[PDB]
């Protein structure tokens, strides 16, 4: 009768986002934290395959995985560290948005995606700023109460982006689709003291597809954005064009 | 016709030293202008990860190959396209990977991620994976064929092609199928291993069993000795769930007062 939540993030176990959320969730749910030991923004859906992973348990039960990715954390949490397995994965609250085509790089999104085969759809929660963690926590709690009110029948992952506003100013929720950007192109070089050039990944590309039905627009307008995600990367609409193309260029056929 | 008619950024996730990338490099160099930009070590499992908290250093080998030190496959393509290469590449080719990248494994794949990073270029990017370790020459011939195809006629729709090659002599490959990604059961094994001081450390276990591996899937194509070609995109939206999620929110009163 009580929800059992595996809580992770990509900011790391000590981040205000995850700690604020953990506090809110523990009011009405059982919560196990399994999270990276440090900041893994940009970890996307990476997994540690070449080495075994070391865990550390804090006094309050929180588990940190040393050099663990967000996916590593959920993998260990679901398969080894929680008995019995969790009802759900919640990942967040992230410091900063996970919108549009940025989502494939997101560690926060990835931890949620790793929980896609559990009893409840996974939640990835990101704040569009750094101030109103309480607002994002309230939205998450509402969603979780929601999921115990009626089953959500389709969608294994919800990507939630919350405006960085006091709760009273959040206008509502929009169900959205992922927008997109032009390709990022600006690298930031910086010389080391020996005059060798090192390279920083620069800013994202300008918004391309950010119209009224997108996650970008919803957040800009002061709404919580909720996008259902899946892991199928197939571009189904391209099927026939590719097939005809192959025949036309004679690849895979003699004639 | 043409020893260097196409400019290729060649990357992988196994790293610059991998036989799969070196075999492919030799094959591509017969007709293309090839620049290798790849990880300095095996980054299998790197998915679409990228380095944000630190700057990246490059290392150039004697043959002109570039490794990005501690670089992920996405780092390599991002840097290769945006800073390192002149002229810029016409296309990204990622591979040949030692091992399959099929079904829902693709989102965790460093090989696929490199190709995905080149999706905005003149030609659609290729990720190329061999279903095993032996017949790199087979995967190379298949890759060369696709590239020659792209120079004969441009591909209209589809920005990334995920190519899986059966580990067979070329003569035994039956043909080519355009496929969709299948999917697996979740991996569920954790392999514990005590360190010298008695601490338990954990290894990620093997992939789950195939779940969706029917006749239209990448899994089935490879299993019956065909090259699988799946067009991929980066849009993670489950568009078919939109109405269900909307109706659901309303029915549970989340986001509305009533
Ligand atoms: Mg983060
Ligand atoms: Mg690999």
From Swiss-Prot, chain B:
A Pfam family this chain is assigned to: SurE
Which cofactors are reported in the record for this sequence? a divalent metal cation
Which InterPro entries does UniProt cross-reference here?
SurE, SurE-like_Pase/nucleotidase, SurE-like_sf
Q: Indicate the family of this protein.
A: Belongs to the SurE nucleotidase family.
Identify the keywords attached in UniProt to this record, alphabetized.
Cytoplasm, Hydrolase, Metal-binding, Nucleotide-binding
Q: Where is this protein found?
A: Cytoplasm
Q: How is the cofactor bound?
A: Binds 1 divalent metal cation per subunit.
Mind telling me which GO cellular component terms the entry cites?
A: cytoplasm
The catalytic activity of this protein is classed by the Enzyme Commission as 3.1.3.5, 3.1.3.6, 3.6.1.11
Kindly provide the name given to this protein in its UniProt entry. Answer: 5'/3'-nucleotidase SurE
Q: What does this protein do?
A: Nucleotidase with a broad substrate specificity as it can dephosphorylate various ribo- and deoxyribonucleoside 5'-monophosphates and ribonucleoside 3'-monophosphates with highest affinity to 3'-AMP. Also hydrolyzes polyphosphate (exopolyphosphatase activity) with the preference for short-chain-length substrates (P20-25). Might be involved in the regulation of dNTP and NTP pools, and in the turnover of 3'-mononucleotides produced by numerous intracellular RNases (T1, T2, and F) during the degradation of various RNAs.
Where a divalent metal cation is bound, by residue?
13-14, 44, 97
Q: Which NCBIfam families match?
A: PRK00346.1-1, PRK00346.1-3, PRK00346.1-4, surE
Name any one GO molecular function. Answer: nucleotide binding
Q: Which reaction does it catalyse?
A: a ribonucleoside 5'-phosphate + H2O = a ribonucleoside + phosphate; a ribonucleoside 3'-phosphate + H2O = a ribonucleoside + phosphate; [phosphate](n) + H2O = [phosphate](n-1) + phosphate + H(+)
Q: Which gene encodes it?
A: surE
């Amino acid at each position: 009768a009580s929800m059992r939540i595996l809580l992770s993030n990509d900011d790391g176990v000590h981040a205000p986002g995850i700690q604020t959320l953990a506090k809110a969730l523990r009011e009405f749910a059982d919560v196990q934290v399994v999270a990276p030991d440090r900041n893994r923004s940009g970890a996307s859906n990476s997994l540690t395959l070449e080495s075994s992973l070391r865990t550390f348990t804090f006094d309050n039960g929180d588990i940190a995985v040393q050099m663990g990715t967000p996916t590593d954390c959920v993998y260990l949490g679901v398969n080894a560290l929680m008995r019995p397995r969790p009802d759900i994965v919640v990942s967040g609250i992230n410091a900063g948005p996970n919108l549009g085509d940025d989502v494939i790089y997101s560690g926060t999104v990835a931890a949620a995606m790793a929980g896609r085969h559990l009893g409840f759809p996974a939640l990835a929660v990101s704040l569009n700023g750094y101030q109103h963690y309480d607002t994002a926590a309230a939205v998450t709690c509402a969603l979780l109460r929601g999921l115990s009110r009626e089953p959500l029948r389709t969608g294994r992952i919800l990507n939630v982006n919350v405006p960085d506003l006091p709760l009273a100013q959040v206008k509502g929720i929009r169900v959205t689709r992922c927008g997109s950007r032009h390709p990022a192109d600006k690298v930031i070089p910086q010389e080391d003291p020996r005059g060798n050039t090192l390279y920083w990944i620069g800013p994202p590309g300008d918004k391309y597809d950010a119209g009224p039905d997108t996650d970008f627009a919803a957040v800009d307008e002061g709404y919580v954005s909720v996008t259902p995600l899946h892991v199928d990367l197939t571009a189904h609409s391209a099927h026939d064009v590719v097939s005809d193309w192959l025949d036309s260029v004679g690849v895979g056929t003699q004639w």
